[PDB]
Amino acid sequence: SYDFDLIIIGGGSGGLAAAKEAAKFDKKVMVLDFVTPTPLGTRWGLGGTCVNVGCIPKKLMHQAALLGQALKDSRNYGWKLEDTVKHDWEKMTESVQNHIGSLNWGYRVALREKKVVYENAYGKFIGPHKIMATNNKGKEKVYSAERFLIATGERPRYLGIPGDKEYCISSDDLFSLPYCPGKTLVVGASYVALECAGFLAGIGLDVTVMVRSILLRGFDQDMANKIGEHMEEHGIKFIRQFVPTKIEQIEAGTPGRLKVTAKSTNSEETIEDEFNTVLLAVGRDSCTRTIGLETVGVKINEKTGKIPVTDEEQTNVPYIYAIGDILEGKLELTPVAIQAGRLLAQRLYGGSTVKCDYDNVPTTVFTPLEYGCCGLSEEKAVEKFGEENIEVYHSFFWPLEWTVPSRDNNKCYAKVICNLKDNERVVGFHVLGPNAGEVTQGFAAALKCGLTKQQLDSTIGIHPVCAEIFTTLSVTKRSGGDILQSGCXG
Amino acid sequence: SYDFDLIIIGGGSGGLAAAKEAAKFDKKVMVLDFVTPTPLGTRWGLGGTCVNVGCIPKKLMHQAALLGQALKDSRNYGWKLEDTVKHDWEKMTESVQNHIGSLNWGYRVALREKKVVYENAYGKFIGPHKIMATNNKGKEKVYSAERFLIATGERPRYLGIPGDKEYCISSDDLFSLPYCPGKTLVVGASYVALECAGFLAGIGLDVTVMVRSILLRGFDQDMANKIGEHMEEHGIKFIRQFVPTKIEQIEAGTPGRLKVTAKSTNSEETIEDEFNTVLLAVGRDSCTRTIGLETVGVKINEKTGKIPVTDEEQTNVPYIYAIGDILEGKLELTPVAIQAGRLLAQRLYGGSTVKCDYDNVPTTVFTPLEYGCCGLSEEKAVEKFGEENIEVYHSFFWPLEWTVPSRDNNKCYAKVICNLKDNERVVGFHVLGPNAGEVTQGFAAALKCGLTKQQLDSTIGIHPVCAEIFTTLSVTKRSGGDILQSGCXG
Ligand SMILES: Cc1cc2nc3c(=O)[nH]c(=O)nc-3n(C[C@H](O)[C@H](O)[C@H](O)COP(=O)(O)OP(=O)(O)OC[C@H]3O[C@@H](n4cnc5c(N)ncnc54)[C@H](O)[C@@H]3O)c2cc1C
Ligand SMILES: Cc1cc2nc3c(=O)[nH]c(=O)nc-3n(C[C@H](O)[C@H](O)[C@H](O)COP(=O)(O)OP(=O)(O)OC[C@H]3O[C@@H](n4cnc5c(N)ncnc54)[C@H](O)[C@@H]3O)c2cc1C
């Protein structure tokens, strides 16, 4: 009877994963994907946040900043480089957009080969088992399905303040900005703000981060503070405990000139400065309010906008599932959405019973000095297991590659958190250093096997590689021992 | 009736570890370390092979090569770099030697602080519990100890051929070469040869590798071949199944000109070419023949020169121990020698029972495209567990960072080897790609916890990071499925 076995609302990370996997079982599948424009009119193609305005262009721009560092390092390794290489914003974003565009077309082609109907249209439920697809020109069409997957992700939140929508940009706009941002104010202090401030400084821009309260709420606060200090020592300026109150345009331009006014968080003080660009990185809102959930009876958390879901990704309505960023109490990460989507299609059409495991999922912040972790933060381990049952082994280290450029000794830092009640099970893993992500992935695998501290110590390091530090952590926070190099021992 | 509790012969990786650890227990310790010069008169300072003529300078030169690549990549990411950056050998080796020099002094200081007597002198046993230290000027002194640790390492092997000692250089000489090597022949095909051929090409030299038989004997042969093909594609020329027969000098110089003659391995064919530098990387010999082992009754394997040892690093003579490269049937790696040395001191003076675990020790080859691995090679897993009990999951991948420079798709490769008789225990782990070492270290930890294929698949990747490929290997070699990108799916 129904038009499709499965209609997927949203063609991002989770959505496309679910589609590609469901297509393996010869089912009629349709992906609806539509990108509503930013307040400034920015649009993009198929593939979701990660592909167009997230991980992909972010890491590419991170890379652009790393390369700036590599240019300086090269002098000391014998490359006869002149004194300063200038960076060119427009050339960079052109390359980035070029890659993105080929991902856009890669997916469009992938869907076609897998025989998945792709409809570039906004999905909205109209009643049980029925959905309306409104296309770009306003034309509607109604479709029915046996099952639905909500995979609509989130969008950047604005402040409630005068001028923010008309003058500020968000990450959605940053990655295809047609001109160089110039002097920038980044408002916010989580992974988006820090990563962006990070690479904008790295390519040579004057950058300021305005912080409401703490850096990286949710992450290990000592790690967060170390990332903060590093950014401060390498250019990025920080304004602590201030929130903007208005953004007014002094001059239009590409970039123009903007006057930002901010109020203290605890006092009455006021500050003004002017910038070329104000980037808002102050959280994201779930796209669940305008997809007609009332008409099919799907319950969402009204305050947060997230969708509560069974451990099988089922909503309260038996035939409607949800995946990715919109899920209540989950994690907002591409590979999680992809795994969730893939395993869902497996359970539905492949007779699998494998659920998606959301415990100890590794993450990485691509701040100038990268931060990789997995498991519990120190504070959370203490909360969960009790202060005197936790042992923290830690150490600084110095990447061999930095010795010859002769920079940044005792900045990189590694800690493992152990549960003394459980054979010193490693319940948290943290690294601050180059290629933090590469380092962390493997250790996340070991956490899944219940790695103990004596198993860790019995693993031999690879030399000379930063990651080897973890096989030799012998100094505890409790012992109070010194952990500075150099060091230079055996 | 002892001067010292422990005399360590050799102040390398293992020796210095054992010394630093033994010193924790307030024992009288002496390190003897002397560097006998290369045939060309090269020597160096405290620290052993790894510090002076191995891991450290090798990685630093590898880094010089990667930075060459980074200069090229930077153009696409918007850095207005001109067309060619020349490299300067003398400036590079100055920086490298500088760092090495500070490690030399670092250790010399570390030993002094730890109250370890350091004697820059050649050790030679003269009789039970007695050793002779011959210093640089030929002055002898006799010392006694309750225990001795032999930690003397190895030295480059030469060929049995005319001109090799007088005209060729080895790794011992390479890292402090006072002039640029120019057009180079590397003889040999294991980790030393390929690593060196690698970075010499990377800094812009004309490089030829001459191979006797196969590449990287002992490592997974398919991995070896891939490394080989990559090197061929990126400059390095290979001469297959040839062995040099003589090296004659055409002209002295810095570099001079050398005429190398080589004979086919299976036919009668002869080839001549001329080079600026011939680098011999054809194995190393244990320094165990000239340390007076006869006089104390220590048994060595006569053919190989290695010392057989109990699982506690004890020789047949109860009071004499051996560590590091000289050990029979072990592995010749810095962190192994360090661990062995550190744990030995723990057993002897710390009442520990923890032995050094030599199974599944991760290694990395720093060829231009790095190769990391841990556990068994495919062929060894088949030999050990039987062909139809092995499942190999594998995939090519394309580092996000390479997409914008737009190079080298489908070169990086990952595979895991699983035992079907043992819940698909991952028994071998192989990766070819950037930061291979960083990726591998963590997975080596997981192998110590008996990581299974399903545990692997339940671990969520970090996006976008190369290492994440391992969380999603779904195509087996047995299935015959295609594994080429791009691809681009969900
Ligand atoms: C700046 C930034 C950096 C990030 N860095 C990382 C990182 O390094 N690593 C990582 O793992 N994650 C990162 N993330 C998070 C990651 O991108 C998201 O968690 C992931 O893309 C979520 O996937 P999803 O399928 O839930 O939503 P999305 O991928 O956003 O998919 C949503 C799709 O549905 C469309 N849509 C919405 N409503 C409708 C509708 N009604 N009808 C039709 N289509 C609709 C949207 O336009 C979008 O295409 C980053 C995010 C940002 C913003
Ligand atoms: C080019 C090259 C690259 C390498 N790359 C890596 C790598 O990336 N990773 C890795 O883990 N390993 C690498 N290795 C191997 C590693 O460096 C060695 O395994 C390690 O140094 C061995 O430690 P050791 O303490 O056994 O011997 P060594 O470190 O060599 O110590 C031996 C010391 O004893 C001295 N000595 C010898 N005889 C006497 C005597 N009779 N009296 C006094 N002193 C004496 C020697 O001069 C030397 O200083 C590399 C080796 C080479 C040659």
Swiss-Prot record, chains A, B:
It catalyses: [thioredoxin]-dithiol + NADP(+) = [thioredoxin]-disulfide + NADPH + H(+); H2O2 + NADPH + H(+) = NADP(+) + 2 H2O. ISGylated. Its cofactor is FAD. The modification N6-succinyllysine is found at residue 59. GO terms for molecular function: FAD binding; identical protein binding; mercury ion binding; NAD(P)H oxidase H2O2-forming activity; NADPH peroxidase activity; selenate reductase activity; thioredoxin-disulfide reductase (NADPH) activity. It holds the Pfam family Pyr_redox_dim. There is a cross-link at residues 488-489 (Cysteinyl-selenocysteine (Cys-Sec)). The active site is at residue 463. Binds 1 FAD per subunit. The modification Phosphotyrosine is found at residue 122. GO terms for cellular component: cytoplasm; cytosol; mitochondrion; neuronal cell body; nucleus. It is an enzyme of class 1 (oxidoreductase). Reduces disulfideprotein thioredoxin (Trx) to its dithiol-containing form. Homodimeric flavoprotein involved in the regulation of cellular redox reactions, growth and differentiation. Contains a selenocysteine residue at the C-terminal active site that is essential for catalysis. Also has reductase activity on hydrogen peroxide (H2O2). This is Thioredoxin reductase 1, cytoplasmic. The gene is Txnrd1.
